[PDB]
């Protein structure tokens, strides 16, 4: 049934969780994405019969609308499973956004952050915990101005509880993590966040190695204002718990006045 039900495009990419195609669903051409995961691969199954974490994940959230990229299907073969997931058209993640036009503006950037806060808190809400919240987990829609998170393959059932294994990525990964191997949910999330801020309002990530992350000092290459910086520097507390609850972040002053999607497409992407 997947043959007949999907025609099969190009190749979007391939990395640490699969191969994901460009697709269509022949019942009614809507644009969708079709990815691959090999079942060697996969280290953290779930249930509902044996499925990888991910599909879990994706139905806990895929309920309503939201700022998350929603599981239209699923099916097994012998040695993968694939999964038919929403492809916004025309579409391009942040990673690539960031890389063409540098450092965004702060306006955009906030519209971006807010958006990203408001997917985040809606995960948490279905009880989900992404871990992997990073720039190339995030899809502009670019008709609409509407960010879409990506890949729950490293993502887990949130708990209240310490996490002692971690997949994500290690550069957007707190210092409780780098030195003792254990991290809460929320906070790790939040430096995450963090880490992303920084990476839009100037265009890099603040930390390379391990022993930056740990001394957790913040430069700034570029122009940003006190206020912005302050937000971020908080997200960054070396202390879990000197770190703000999402509340805190989007009652911050940097967060008043953002603009809607749509407007933000209109001033920013058209
Ligand atoms: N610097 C970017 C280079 N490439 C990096 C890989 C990327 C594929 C992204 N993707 C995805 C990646 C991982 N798990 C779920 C995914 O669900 C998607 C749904 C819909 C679209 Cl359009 C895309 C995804 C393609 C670009």
Redo the contacts with the bound molecule.
């Keep these: 049934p997947l043959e007949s039900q999907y025609q099969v495009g190009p190749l ?4 640490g ?2 191969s ?1 195609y ?1 697709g269509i669903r022949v019942s009614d051409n809507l644009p969708v ?1 079709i ?1 691959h995961v090999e079942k060697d691969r996969i280290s953290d199954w779930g249930e509902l019969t044996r499925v990888p974490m991910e599909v879990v994940l994706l139905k806990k959230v895929s309920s309503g609308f939201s700022g998350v ?1 929603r599981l239209l299907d699923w099916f097994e073969r012998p040695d993968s499973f694939v999964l038919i ?4 058209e025309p ?1 391009q ?1 942040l ?2 956004f960031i890389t063409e036009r540098g450092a965004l503006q702060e306006e955009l950037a906030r519209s971006f952050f807010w958006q990203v806060l408001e997917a985040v808190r809606h995960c948490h809400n279905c009880g989900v915990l992404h871990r992997d919240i990073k720039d ?2 995030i ?1 502009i829609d670019l008709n609409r101005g509407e960010l879409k998170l ?2 729950f ?1 490293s993502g887990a059932l949130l708990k209240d509880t310490v996490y002692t294994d971690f997949d994500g990525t290690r550069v957007y990964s707190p210092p409780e993590w780098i030195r003792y191997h254990r991290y809460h949910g929320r906070s790790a999330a939040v430096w995450s966040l963090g880490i992303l801020l920084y990476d839009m309002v100037c265009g890099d990530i603040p930390f390379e190695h391990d022993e930056e992350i740990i001394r957790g000092q913040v430069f700034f290459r570029q122009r940003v204002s006190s206020e912005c910086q302050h937000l971020i520097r908080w997200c960054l507390a070396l202390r879990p718990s000197d770190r703000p609850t999402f509340e805190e972040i989007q009652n911050h002053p940097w967060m008043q006045d953002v603009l809607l999607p749509q407007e933000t497409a209109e001033i920013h992407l058209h």
């Design positions: 979007l990419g391939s990395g969780f699969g994901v460009s994405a990815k990229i997931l929403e492809r916004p579409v993640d990673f690539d190339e987990n899809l990506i890949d393959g």
